[PDB]
Structures are given as C-alpha cells and as structure tokens.
Amino acid sequence: KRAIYPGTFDPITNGHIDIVTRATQMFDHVILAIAASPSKKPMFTLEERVALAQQATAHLGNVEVVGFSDLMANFARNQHATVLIRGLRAVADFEYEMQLAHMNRHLMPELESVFLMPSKEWSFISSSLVKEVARHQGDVTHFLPENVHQALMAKLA
Amino acid sequence: MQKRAIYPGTFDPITNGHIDIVTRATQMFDHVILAIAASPSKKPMFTLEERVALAQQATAHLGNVEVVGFSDLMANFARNQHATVLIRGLRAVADFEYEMQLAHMNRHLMPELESVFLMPSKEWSFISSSLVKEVARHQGDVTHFLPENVHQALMAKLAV
Amino acid sequence: MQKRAIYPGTFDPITNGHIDIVTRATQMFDHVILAIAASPSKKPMFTLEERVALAQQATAHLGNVEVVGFSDLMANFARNQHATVLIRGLRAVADFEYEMQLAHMNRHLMPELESVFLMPSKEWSFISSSLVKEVARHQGDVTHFLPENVHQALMAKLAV
Amino acid sequence: KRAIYPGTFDPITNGHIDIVTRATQMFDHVILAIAASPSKKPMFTLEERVALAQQATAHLGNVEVVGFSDLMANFARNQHATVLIRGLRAVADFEYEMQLAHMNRHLMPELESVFLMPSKEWSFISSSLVKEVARHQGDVTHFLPENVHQALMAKLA
Amino acid sequence: MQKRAIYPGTFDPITNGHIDIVTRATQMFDHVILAIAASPSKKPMFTLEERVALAQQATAHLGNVEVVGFSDLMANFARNQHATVLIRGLRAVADFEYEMQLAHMNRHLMPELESVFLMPSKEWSFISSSLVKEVARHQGDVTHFLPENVHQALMAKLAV
Amino acid sequence: KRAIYPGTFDPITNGHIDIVTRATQMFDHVILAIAASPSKKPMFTLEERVALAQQATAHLGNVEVVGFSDLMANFARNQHATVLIRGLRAVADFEYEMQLAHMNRHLMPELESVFLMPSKEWSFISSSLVKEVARHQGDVTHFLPENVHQALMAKLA
Ligand SMILES: COC(=O)N1CCC(Oc2cccc([C@@H](CC#N)Nc3nc4n(n3)C(=O)CC(C)=N4)c2)CC1
Ligand SMILES: COC(=O)N1CCC(Oc2cccc([C@@H](CC#N)Nc3nc4n(n3)C(=O)CC(C)=N4)c2)CC1
Ligand SMILES: COC(=O)N1CCC(Oc2cccc([C@@H](CC#N)Nc3nc4n(n3)C(=O)CC(C)=N4)c2)CC1
Ligand SMILES: COC(=O)N1CCC(Oc2cccc([C@@H](CC#N)Nc3nc4n(n3)C(=O)CC(C)=N4)c2)CC1
Ligand SMILES: COC(=O)N1CCC(Oc2cccc([C@@H](CC#N)Nc3nc4n(n3)C(=O)CC(C)=N4)c2)CC1
Ligand SMILES: COC(=O)N1CCC(Oc2cccc([C@@H](CC#N)Nc3nc4n(n3)C(=O)CC(C)=N4)c2)CC1
C-alpha cells in the first residue's frame, strides 16, 4: 500500500512531520512529494526543500522525499500510489481540499484522498505563519525540525 | 501491514452515502468493521436488529466488511476489535467542526487509533440519514439515496 | 414572465427578518406565497391559526403576498401551487450550510423549482424566531424585532 | 425584469453556464457582465472573455454578454437591472458575497442580490482551479464549453 | 478603571476549559462574576446547588472570582450586578457564529455591556461540558478535562 | 491596564474607529499600532496611516497612535501592554485570529488576545473593500472618518 503526501513544504514544519509520521504508521510506503511551485515564489528552492525534508524525515524508514512539477494526479499514478494524504487545519483549507479531492477524483478515480488531523500542538501552524514570525525575528525553534530552523535563520540572515 | 479499520455510526438507516464511504474504506484497508451504535441518544427509527440486518444485506457484496453492533464507548470497542484506523466521512463544514472535536477526544482516549477522513461522492455530500427520514416521512421521494433493501424497509416502516 | 414564488417556513412567530425577506421577494416576483408549516417537529409556541393570522396582518400592506398553511412536503406543495421559485433568507454560515443541503434535496424532488437566496438587512441578520422567543421568555425586550401585532400576541402568550 | 450576472469569467466555465441558464429561466433578460479586472492580471483579455462567453451562451436567446470597468452598482443601474445574480460555492465566497451585497445595498438600495446554487456537478469548480489543472496539462474538457476549452489549450500551448 | 466582568453559562459541570477562561478574565479585570444559569432548557446533569458548589471549589484559588446563580435574562442580571464586560470563550466556528448572534442581541438589550471574547488553551479548545458528559456516560476517561472535585462528583453521579 | 490594537489600517475605517472606541471604554490606555507592512504594498505610507489615525482618534483622550516594524508580541511587551484587541468579522478572519493568538501565546504567554465585535453598521466593511469601491469611484463617505475620506479621494485623483 503506497501513499503520497504532497504539498509545497516551504519549509517542512513539525505539523508536516506529525502528518507524515501518522501516514507511515498506516501505509507501507509514503512518498512525501514536494511541488516545485515557481508561481508562488517559494522562499526555498525545490532542491533545498527536498534536502530539508529528507534530513527531517531520515529517522522514518518508509518515507521517500521527491520533487514534482507534474499534475498531482499524474504524479500519484506514476508513483503507483492509491492514497493521497492531506492534513486538516481550518475551514478555508477544508473547503479547498474538497475542491482538489473532487477534481482529483475526476482525473484519477482510484486515487483516494485521505485526511489526517495533526496534533493540537501544530493545529494553528503553517509554513507561511512560521516564515512571517521568523521574518520579524520571532523565535520559531519549537515549530520546526532542527535542520529546517537553521536553514530558515540562514536564509533570513 | 494488515490494517483493521472501524467505521462507526448509528446508520439509522444506512444510506448510499454510508455505502460510498465503506466501499472506499474496503479499497484501502484489509478489514473494515461497520460498527452500529446500539443505543443512540434519541430513539432510532429502526431498531438495532433492523439497522444491523439492513447494513449486512447492503454491504454483502464487500468481502472484507463485517457489520457489528456496539454499546461501549466507540474507542473502547475499537481497542477491543484491534482496529487502528477509525473511518469517518466529511460532507461539509458542520461535519468538519464536529469530527475534529471528536478526533481530539478519541486521540486522548485511544492514541493508537488513527482518525482517517474520507470524502463521499458529490452525489451523497448533502444527505444524512436524518434528512432522508424527514423527506420520506413528509412524502418525498428518497429512492435514489438508499440501497433497495433500505428503500423497502423504510416504506414498510412509514406505512404503519 | 409571470413568476410565482414560495417563501416557506414555520414563522413561529413571523419576525421583522421574515417581513424584510418577503418584502424583497414581492419586489422581484409577481406573486409570493408565504407558506406556513402546519406541524413542525417541536410543538410551536403559536398554533398554525395564530401563525397564519399574525403573518396575514403583518403582510396585509403587500398586495402580491398570499399567506397559506401547508402540511405536505414543501416541494409537493410548491408544485401544486405552480411555484417555480423557492425563496429562502441567508443570515450566516449555519444557514448557508443547511440551506445548500436542502436546496440539493429540493432540486432532486422538484427540478423545475429554482432555489433563490436573499440576504436580509444587517438589522435582522442575527435574529431568528427561536432567539426572539428565548429572549422574550427570559424577560428581554424584543419589540424592535417584531411587527406590532406579533409583539402584542407574544406578550399575551407569555403572560399566561 | 432585468438581471445582471457579473464576474471576471476568466474563462467562463460550465459552472457559470449552469448559473446563467438558471437565471434565464427566472428573468426576461439577463446581462452577463464581465469585469475588465486588470489588477488581477487575467489570463484572457476582456475582448477574449466577452467573445468566449458570447459563443458559450449563444444558444440562450435572452442573454446579453457585455464588458465593464465601472463600479458594479453603477453598471447595474445603467443596465436598468434590479437583480444581481451570484452563484454560491464555499463559505469564503458566501462571506465575501455578503460583504459585496451589503456594500451594493448602500450604493443602490433597489438592486436585489440573488444567490443561486449550481448543480452538484460544478459545485467544486472555479475558473482558477480549471486554469491550475490546465497549466499542468490535466484534462479539463468536462468543465468548460468546447470553444473555451480550445481557447484555454491554445493560450497555454 | 475598576471593571466588573460577568462570565455566564450553564457550567454543567464546570470544566478545565471554563477554568482556563475565568483565569484569563481574572488577569485582566478587577472582579469577575462566574454566573451560573439556574434553569437551562434541558434538565442539567447537576442541580444548580451542585454546579455552584463545584464552581466555587474549583475557582477558590482565584481571589477576584465570585460564583453566583442567576435566573433572569443574562443582560438583566449583568446590569443589576454593575458588570460592564461580558466574557465568553471562543473554541471554533460553531461558537463564533452563535456568540456573534448573542452579542448583537445583548448589545440591543444592554448597550453599555461590552462583549469580550477570549480563546482557551489548545488543550481545551475541542471540549464542552456536553462532550465530557457523553464520553463519561459511555465509559470514557475524562479526568484530564476536569478539576479534581468535578471528576469526583461526575463519577459519583454516573455510579447511581 | 494597557491594551494594544494592531493592524495595517490602510486606511483606518469607521469599523476600526468603532473597535478602538469600545477598547477605550474598557482599558485605561489604548495603543493603536500600525504595521509598516511593506510586503503588502499598502496604498498609504506608514507616516500617512499614522497621521490619518491620529486625526481620526484625536477626540479619544486615551488613544496613542504609533507605527511598528517589529514582531507584534515584542512590540506589545515593549509597550507594557498585556491585552491585544482584534475585531471579529468573518470566519476567515476568526480562523486567522486563532492562529495569531496561539502563536502570540507561545511568544508572550501573558499577552491576552481579546476579541471585540463591531457594530452591525461596520460588520461587512474592510479597508480593502472600501479601497476597491473607491478605485471604481463609488461613494465611501459613510465608511470613513472625514480626514481619511479626503486623503483617499486625493490619493486616487
Ligand atoms: C490533494 O492535493 C492536491 O491536489 N495537491 C495539488 C495542489 C498542491 O500542490 C501543488 C502546488 C503548486 C503546484 C503544483 C503542481 C506541480 C508543480 N509545481 N501540480 C498541480 N497539480 C494540481 N494542481 N497543481 C492544482 O493546483 C490542482 C490540482 C487538482 N492538481 C502542486 C497541493 C497538493
Ligand atoms: C468519531 O466517531 C465517534 O466518535 N463515534 C462515537 C459517537 C457516534 O456513535 C455513537 C452514537 C450513539 C452512541 C454511541 C455509544 C455506544 C452506543 N450505543 N458510544 C459512544 N462512544 C462515544 N460516544 N458514544 C460519544 O458520545 C462520544 C465519543 C467520543 N465516543 C456511539 C459516532 C461515532
Ligand atoms: C428550503 O425550504 C425547505 O426545504 N423547507 C421545508 C422544511 C421547512 O418547513 C417545514 C417545517 C416543518 C414541517 C414541514 C413539512 C410540512 C408540515 N407541517 N414539510 C416538509 N417538507 C420538507 N420537509 N418537511 C423536510 O423536513 C425537508 C424537506 C426537503 N422538505 C416543513 C423549511 C422550508
Ligand atoms: C455582487 O457582485 C459584485 O459586487 N461584484 C463586484 C466585484 C466583482 O467584479 C469585479 C471584479 C474586478 C473589478 C471590478 C470592477 C470593474 C472592473 N474592472 N468594479 C467593481 N465594482 C465593485 N467592485 N469592483 C468591488 O470590488 C466591490 C464592489 C461593491 N463594487 C468588478 C464581482 C461582482
Ligand atoms: C453571551 O451569553 C449569553 O447570552 N448568555 C445567555 C444564555 C446562556 O445562559 C443561559 C442558559 C440558560 C438559561 C439562561 C437564562 C437564566 C436562567 N436560568 N437567561 C437567559 N438570558 C438570555 N437567555 N437566557 C437566552 O436564551 C438568550 C439571551 C440573549 N439571554 C441563561 C449563556 C450566556
Ligand atoms: C493578533 O494580531 C497580530 O498578531 N498581528 C500581527 C499581524 C498583523 O500585523 C502586521 C501586518 C504586517 C506586518 C506586521 C509585522 C510588523 C511590520 N511591518 N509584525 C508581525 N508580527 C507578527 N507578524 N507580523 C505575523 O505575521 C504573525 C505574528 C504572530 N506576529 C504586522 C495583525 C496584528
């Protein structure tokens, strides 16, 4: 059973670590898939985001970190994945996830969208919120893996 | 991994929305327990025996579904059944809010039970057993939203 | 086009929020049926006869409003009345969710009945008949939210 | 009875066709009004969006497609429209529509905002979602009128 | 400014979520009235005397909290108590919608009473007295969500 | 008791005047704090926004208008404020406010986030909505203090 956990992960947070960890306890192999997403002008390049997520998930033996520029549904089919993992946060996210899931069901009917709920600890966090706090020199050590926190400080320095 | 998943609810009666969710669950987990609550807060339209018999007949074509009644705390029953995945459907915002509140409570009760939310077909996202019962009680056509055996049982129930 | 619109509900009692919606509906459709549900799920504070009489007096200044009681499925009554437009007010998110679920059900029941959502004045967006009744029962001033005849009937009802 | 159905329609989808069709069954004349909206940098020019919507609604005899750069409420008054049609989709849209409706009621009290619900078939779709799928080469033929699907493929080619 | 704030509710029973909110309120206002509704719509699990005694013992460490029962309209009681601040907790969207509707009503009833919304710790955002009671009734562990005296009273109540 | 009311206030509206007035009836001293926010490309410079808010709140004796580029929580600590005022509007805002409040509680546990509800009169308005109406020449005199309405007309002229 293969699952894909896609997103921009700019950068990967403890919220994302929590969701991917939960996914590895349910599925034999989890592909953490990072969207190149040039249109959103990410803070970190695709190569940097992949390296950070690789280092942050190295302790999980059944996680594979990959980058993609393809249509989500085509990438999932090409990874032989039948499960798509997304974390639920707020109503805006939930409504957007429902749009993506109905669209993905039209593109790949056998790809099942599965929603996980992160720990209360990471419910309110996002990569954007952590970057905004960090841009104004606020302490974000609690919200990120060690390697990511160092890379974020270095990027803003 | 040989995963055991639980899909709990009152299923009063089981609808095509429930069939959709349980079918999706059987496609990703080895064994699915469709768990029927014995004693809901409000008296159900269908007795537990009727709910269990309707759900069994409506899921008989799914080889890895087991329909079982339960009266314990859902998490206590899931633990006893060795289920490590809890399945719930999410139709709209109202569901999202309530299901998130239940998921945090269940994680406190049974941390090893993972809550997994699936989304039903657009065809069933606006239906619930309550809405179907209300429409049928008030003389509206609900045939499209139910398995045939449930449509037959509901007509018989409303006729008396 | 000579459109017939239906504005259904329990109207227990009719409030200034309902007056606002029905007034807007009369400005866009030739004939509006303000349809009162005979037998709601919970016993209403006002009997059907009181609800109909209050609604008639409160809308008497609107020439193209007809107040009528109904006990059938709302869509069955709309079809029988030759109404092709169903009017509902949308106050907040809770309304939006429930009304969308009802609209999909009604489209299945009567595809030729179009659901049209109107938004009340900011003055009435936070009120409901239930909230007005709860405030008045607990000795709060609700005069501003009701037509004069309803204010009189509610005071008489609570006095006994 | 004249109704106006405004929006950016960049490009017009089957969701928009469904709403305008429902509007023509209720009102004698429907103006489908396209906002020039240069600030949002549309994919299609105003002239292209008007031509696409004209072709896609040609089978509906009581639809008139026009472009506008004016304040919505002023344009509606100048079209002798007393009804404003909007389709409801998600909570974010509904909350935004409520803000526009209260603002429009202050600018033109006699302009009644009317909300329609699209078919379940088009509930999750938007022009942005269709463009995003198409930008990554996903099949969007189901979601658009034929002429629009050809114009979108051509624009991205 | 010597502000008097009111924190009203049914508190059936008082939870750690309520303790969190009242503690935050005591940190910003000179005096806080934790106001307990005498006669809720549905019969409470705990009598008013039990709710008041539990709330008093659970807030005894807060020097500027006064626990009082009330049966009037909340705004009428707040006016009589010279409270100018009304405290309510906001956990999620469902709360936000209902609390906004209540706040507009209270502003109409008592314009000089300002509604102030506080947000509880992440630890209690998914809990309510109703959810705690439902979990405990169905044999689930709720010790973490309650003050010790409430945990003791709830176990005694469910045992009989 | 000192409270801080932060935001971008680009420009300050009657919705903001209503919230700050309510705040001054509850707290001895209210700091209305304007975020420099260059990343959002505000219509008005920080100096213009501060001058407008100063003039619009001059009739309230216990309001101090200041600009800031710092992390919110650090600015509040440095102002000796223990209360943070935010107005509630829509679900999107409420969900975003909950994220900020949990983040601020991690950065400054003693800073209590307090939410006020504006008058029904200003519930649907925002600085963005007023600017959008004004950009298309719609009458926004009802929604802004006199000095702000003049400055907005002048800026767009
Ligand atoms: C259920 O999950 C998803 O459906 N996702 C896809 C969107 C998003 O990840 C991105 C973000 C930016 C760009 C991309 C690009 C690849 C690059 N570069 N592919 C892509 N495929 C899509 N896209 N975009 C959509 O916008 C909508 C859709 C149904 N399919 C993905 C989250 C994951
Ligand atoms: C995530 O799902 C859920 O959390 N479930 C449980 C609630 C509900 O199924 C019911 C309905 C009625 C009664 C019951 C009874 C058994 C009987 N008879 N057990 C039960 N277990 C609970 N209960 N009640 C709650 O009230 C809350 C909670 C967290 N756990 C279950 C849906 C499934
Ligand atoms: C879009 O509006 C609605 O859908 N309406 C119908 C529900 C409600 O008005 C009531 C209330 C109580 C009872 C009734 C009774 C008549 C009596 N007595 N008919 C009725 N028709 C229904 N009903 N119930 C439902 O429960 C659901 C549904 C889709 N159609 C109507 C609001 C209007
Ligand atoms: C109820 O509908 C609406 O109220 N609408 C207006 C907004 C939107 O269509 C646009 C989009 C971009 C720009 C425009 C421009 C024209 C161009 N170019 N006119 C315009 N008039 C407005 N605008 N913007 C607002 O932002 C708010 C408001 C109350 N009135 C319209 C949807 C329709
Ligand atoms: C903003 O808070 C609130 O608005 N409150 C009031 C409601 C509720 O506390 C109750 C619960 C049950 C009964 C009561 C009784 C007293 C007894 N017994 N008074 C009361 N006052 C009200 N009531 N009911 C309403 O139904 C609506 C309203 C605006 N004001 C209060 C929460 C606090
Ligand atoms: C509860 O309120 C808030 O928490 N606020 C902060 C965000 C927002 O005001 C801004 C807007 C733009 C930029 C800024 C800059 C200063 C400049 N320039 N400081 C800042 N501090 C933050 N920021 N951003 C975040 O994005 C998130 C966060 C928890 N703290 C503030 C509203 C107030």
The verdict on the CB of residue A132 being under 6 Å from ligand 6 is: yes
**From the list D22, D26, D113, which residue is nearest C119 (CB)?**
D113
Ligand 3 proximity of C8 Cβ (cutoff 6 Å): yes
Question: Strand, helix or coil at C118?
Answer: strand
Whole-number Å distance between alpha carbons of A4 and A92:
22
Beta strands in chain B (DSSP E): 4-9, 31-37, 65-70, 85-89, 114-118
Q: What is the DSSP string of E50-113?
A: HHHHHHHHHHTT-TTEEEEEE-S-HHHHHHHTT--EEEEE--SHHHHHHHHHHHHHHHHH-TTS
Are the CB atoms for B140 and C73 separated by under 8 Å?
yes
Kindly give the pairing relationship between strand F83-87 and strand A2-7.
Answer: unpaired
Domains and CATH numbers, chain D: 1-157 (3.40.50.620)
- Residue pair A50/A22 in contact (Cβ under 8 Å)? The answer is no
Helix, strand or coil, per DSSP, at residue E5: strand
Residues in chain C: 160
Residue at A105: amino acid letter: R
Backbone angles phi, psi at F52, to 5 degrees: -60, -45
The reply to whether D16 belongs to the active site is yes
Q: Which of A91, A120, A124 sits opposite E123 (nearest CB)?
A: A120
Interstrand relation of C65-70 and E114-118 (parallel, antiparallel or unpaired): unpaired
The length of chain D, given as a count of residues: 157
Query: Which pair of structure tokens corresponds to residue D64?
Result: 């008139």
F139 touches chain D (CB under 8 A): yes
Q: Which residue of D has its CA nearest to A68?
A: D136
E149/E30 Cα distance (integer angstroms): 26
Q: Are A93 and A65 in contact (CB under 8 A)?
A: no
Cis peptide before F11 (omega within 30 of 0): yes
- Give CA–CA dist E110/C136, Å, rounded: 14
Please tell me what DSSP assigns to residue E134: H
Q: What is the distance in A from the centroid of ligand 3 to the CA of C74?
A: 5
Which of A78, A81, A73 has its CA nearest to residue A105? A73
* C123 vs F91, F120, F124: nearest CB: F120
User: What does the alpha-carbon distance between residue B95 and residue B128 come to, in Å, rounded to a whole number?
Assistant: 11
CB E110 within 8 A of CB E73: no
- Check if B90 contacts A (Cβ < 8 Å): yes
User: What are residue C34's phi and psi, to 5 degrees?
Assistant: -90, 105
Instruction: With CA atoms as reference, report the closest residue to A125 among E91, F101, F112.
Output: F101
State whether residue A142 sits within 8 Å of chain F by CB: yes
A86 annotated as ligand-binding: yes
Dihedral angle sign, alpha carbons of residues A87, A88, A94, A98: positive
- Asked whether E101 lines ligand 5 (CB < 6 A), one says no
Distance between CA atoms of E111 and F25, rounded to whole angstroms? 12
Is there a contact between C73 and B140 if contact means CB atoms under 8 Å apart?
yes
Q: Helix, strand or coil for residue C38?
A: coil
* d(C-alpha F14, C-alpha F119), whole Å: 10
Residue D119 carries which side chain, given as an amino acid letter? S
Minimal-distance CA residue to ligand 6 atom 30: F72
Minimal-distance CA residue to ligand 6 atom 14:
F35
The β-bridge partners of D68 are D35
Best probe residue, ligand 2, of E133, E138, E144, E158 (max atoms within 8 Å of C-beta): E138
Q: How far apart, in whole angstroms, are the C-alpha atoms of residue E42 and residue A120? A: 31
- The interaxial angle of helices E93-109 and C129-137, nearest 10 deg, is 50
Say yes or no: CB of residue C39 within 6 Å of ligand 3. yes
Tell me how far apart the alpha carbons of residues B86 and B95 are, in angstroms, rounded to a whole number.
Answer: 15
* Inter-chain residue contact B101 with E93, CB threshold 8 Å: no
- Tell how strand B65-70 and strand B31-37 pair up: parallel
**Entry resolution (Å):** 2.0
Q: Measured between CA atoms, how close is A99 to chain B, in angstroms?
A: 11
CB-based contacts of E84: which residues, under 8 Å, 6+ apart?
E3, E4, E5, E112, E113, E114, F25, F26
Q: Enter the tokens of residue E59.
A: 């807030």
Question: CA distances (Å), D11 to each of A89, D7, D16, D45, D96, in order?
Answer: 30, 10, 9, 10, 20
- Which residues, at least 6 apart from B47, have a Cβ–Cβ distance to it below 8 Å? none
Q: Which residue has the tokens 């005591």?
A: E26
Annotated catalytic residue E133: no
At A143, which helix (H) or strand (E)?
A: none
Technique used by the depositors: X-ray
**F positions 93-122 inside 8 Å of A (CB):** 95, 98-99, 102-103, 106-107
Distance CA(A72)–CA(D139), nearest Å, equals 12
Question: Which residue among E126, E128, E135 sits closest to B73, beta carbon to beta carbon?
Answer: E135
Residue labelled with tokens 């999202």: B96
Instruction: Report the residue among A88, A100, A112 best suited for mutation to probe ligand 1: largest number of ligand atoms under 8 A from its CB.
Output: A100
F135 is an annotated ligand-binding site residue: no
Beta-carbon neighbour count of residue B111 at 10 Å? 9
Q: Return contacts of F76-81, CB within 8 angstroms, 24+ apart.
A: F76/F4, F76/F6, F76/F104, F76/F108, F76/F111, F77/F108, F77/F111, F79/F2, F79/F4, F79/F31, F79/F33, F80/F2, F81/F2, F81/F3, F81/F4, F81/F31, F81/F111
Please give the backbone phi and psi of residue F77, each rounded to the nearest 5 degrees, phi first. Answer: -60, -45
CA–CA–CA angle F86, E123, E151 (5° rounding): 125
d(C-alpha E108, C-alpha B48), whole Å: 48
- Check if the beta carbon of residue A73 is closer than 8 Å to that of residue A104: yes
Q: Is F98 annotated as a binding residue?
A: no
Residues of F within 8 A of D103 (CB-CB) are: 124-125, 129, 133
Q: DSSP characters for C45-98?
A: SS-HHHHHHHHHHHHTT-TTEEEEEE-S-HHHHHHHTT--EEEEE--SHHHHHH
Angle, CA E118 vertex, CA E115 and CA E123 arms, to 5°: 155
What tokens does B56 get? Answer: 């069994």
For an interface test with C, the pick among F95, F120, F123, F142 (most C C-beta atoms closer than 10 Å) comes out as F120
Cα–Cα distance list, E138 to B103, C49, E134 (Å): 16, 44, 6
Distances in whole angstroms, Cα of residue D124 to Cα of each of A106, D9, D15: 11, 16, 9
φ/ψ of B138, rounded to 5, equals -95, 15
Length of chain A (residues): 157
**Cα(C135)–Cα(C103) distance, rounded to whole angstroms?**
30
CA distance E12 to E43: 10
Q: Which residues contact D36 (CB under 8 A, 6 or more apart)?
A: D46, D67, D68, D69
